[PDB]
Design a protein around this nucleic acid. Structure first.
Ligand SMILES: [Mg+2]
Ligand SMILES: [Zn+2]
Ligand SMILES: [Zn+2]
Ligand SMILES: [Zn+2]
Lengths: 103, 93, 55, 100
RNA sequence: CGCUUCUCGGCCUUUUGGCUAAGAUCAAGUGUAGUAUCUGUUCAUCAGUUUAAUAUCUGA
RNA sequence: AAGGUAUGUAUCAAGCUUACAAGUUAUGUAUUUACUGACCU
């Protein structure tokens, strides 16, 4: 299911602080539900300290609305180019801005 | 038989433990993890009581396990309501 | 012949260290060898050295 | 029992019919519900021992095997001198488990 | 008195050393009745309601 | 033939060796996590 509540997010933050980056079985060894694939998936999808998980700018939105017209799907190719880079934060932006350009 | 390329094991091994001993070791391991993380954070309000549970000491709040404590570092900011106790500590900035 | 639970649906879902997980199952391999024991152990192919088991 | 708090006892006048326990519950006391020190036989009323219900388990309602007893700790508290301890209703356990 | 260098001590990364194919793989739990605890969360003057006392309703 | 039934220590003789050199309480809830009852095929 992969629900990822807070009491495992903070333990994952502690584990990545202790063990490292390319070492995921050793920190899935202490979570009782999760495998190492799900640990990689969250720590690069939600818990990465480089993720600017708020603050929608104005430069990146005028960037993506004619960056997601170049390659129309593919929000994992244009995720590092935007650098909002969660690859669904981009999809949140694009569906919100095509609601606000419709209303 | 491949005596070279069979998945090895050592004699007198005793084998891999059951689920109860494994996740008890997981809870002890996770205890050592959270203790060393708060030791690195140098938190002076983490207390462990007489029965293996965790307490925010300024907060006076109980916590069953480790991630119940170290997810109580964000709500109910007495953490900055010690600015009143710092004003009693020193009448200026 | 054998019928008994080589599928062994969820076996009794045990812990299986390493060599009991991936190693080869010796027991059909040795019951086949038991089964043709008169012709795999015949007394007169080379008729030199033979070794009797104790007891 | 003490475990399932919604089970109700019969509590009518105890006749001469000796209580019985199923094979799954042999040795259980009826009130304090433990295994040690049985001291006093169970006498159940005539409505809870009639016809089809004879020799049937006090607790489970399964087919009885051995005689039922109270503890010494039920005896000296005189929890045997109340009504007949025949658990009447089947409620919220071994019903939903049957539907599961 | 000041300046550069030298040596002794008060000391703030030291994990078992290196290399292979990250060496290699792995990691099942239910249902029932109840509690405790975090997180999220929010907290103008009568009259009778109610409560041990307190705190909803209605009143201007 | 090796590759599997480990090796590493501490006392106790034959094997082998010379036969030699030698005077802030609190609520309502969304909500996990822990815990209880010899609860249960
Ligand atoms: Mg080996
Ligand atoms: Zn009893
Ligand atoms: Zn009765
Ligand atoms: Zn019974």
């Amino acid at each position: 299911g992969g629900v990822w509540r807070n009491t495992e997010d903070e333990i994952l933050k502690a584990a990545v602080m202790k063990y490292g980056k390319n070492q995921w079985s050793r920190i899935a060894s202490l979570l009782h539900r999760k495998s190492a694939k799900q640990c990689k998936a969250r720590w690069y999808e939600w818990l990465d300290p480089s993720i600017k998980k708020t603050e929608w700018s104005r430069e990146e939105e005028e960037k993506l609305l004619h960056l997601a017209k170049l390659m129309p799907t593919q929000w994992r190719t244009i995720a590092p180019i935007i650098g909002r880079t969660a690859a669904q934060c981009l999809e949140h932006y694009e569906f919100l801005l095509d609601k606000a350009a419709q209303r | 038989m491949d005596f070279q390329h069979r998945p090895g094991g050592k004699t007198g091994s005793g084998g891999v433990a059951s689920s109860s001993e494994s996740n008890r070791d997981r809870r002890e391991r996770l205890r050592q993890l959270a203790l060393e993380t708060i030791d690195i954070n140098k938190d002076p309000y983490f207390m462990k009581n007489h029965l293996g549970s965790y307490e925010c000491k300024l907060c006076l709040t109980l916590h069953n396990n480790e991630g119940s404590y170290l997810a109580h570092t964000q709500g109910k900011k007495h953490q900055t309501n010690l600015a009143r106790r710092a004003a009693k500590e020193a009448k200026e900035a | 012949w054998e019928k008994a639970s080589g599928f062994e649906e969820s076996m009794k879902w045990k812990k299986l260290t390493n060599a009991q997980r991936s190693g080869l199952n010796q027991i059909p391999n040795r019951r086949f060898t038991l089964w043709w024991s008169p012709t795999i152990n015949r007394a007169n192919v080379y008729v030199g050295f033979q070794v009797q088991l104790d007891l | 029992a003490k475990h399932h708090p919604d089970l109700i006892f019969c509590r009518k006048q105890a006749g001469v019919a000796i209580g019985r326990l199923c094979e799954k519950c042999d040795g259980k006391c009826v009130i304090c519900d433990s295994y040690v020190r049985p001291c006093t036989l169970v006498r159940i009323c005539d409505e809870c021992n009639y016809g089809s219900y004879q020799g049937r388990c006090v607790i489970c309602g399964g087919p009885g095997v051995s005689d039922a007893y109270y503890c010494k700790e039920c005896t000296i508290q005189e929890k045997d001198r109340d009504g007949c301890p025949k658990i009447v209703n089947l409620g919220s356990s071994k019903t939903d488990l049957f539907y599961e």
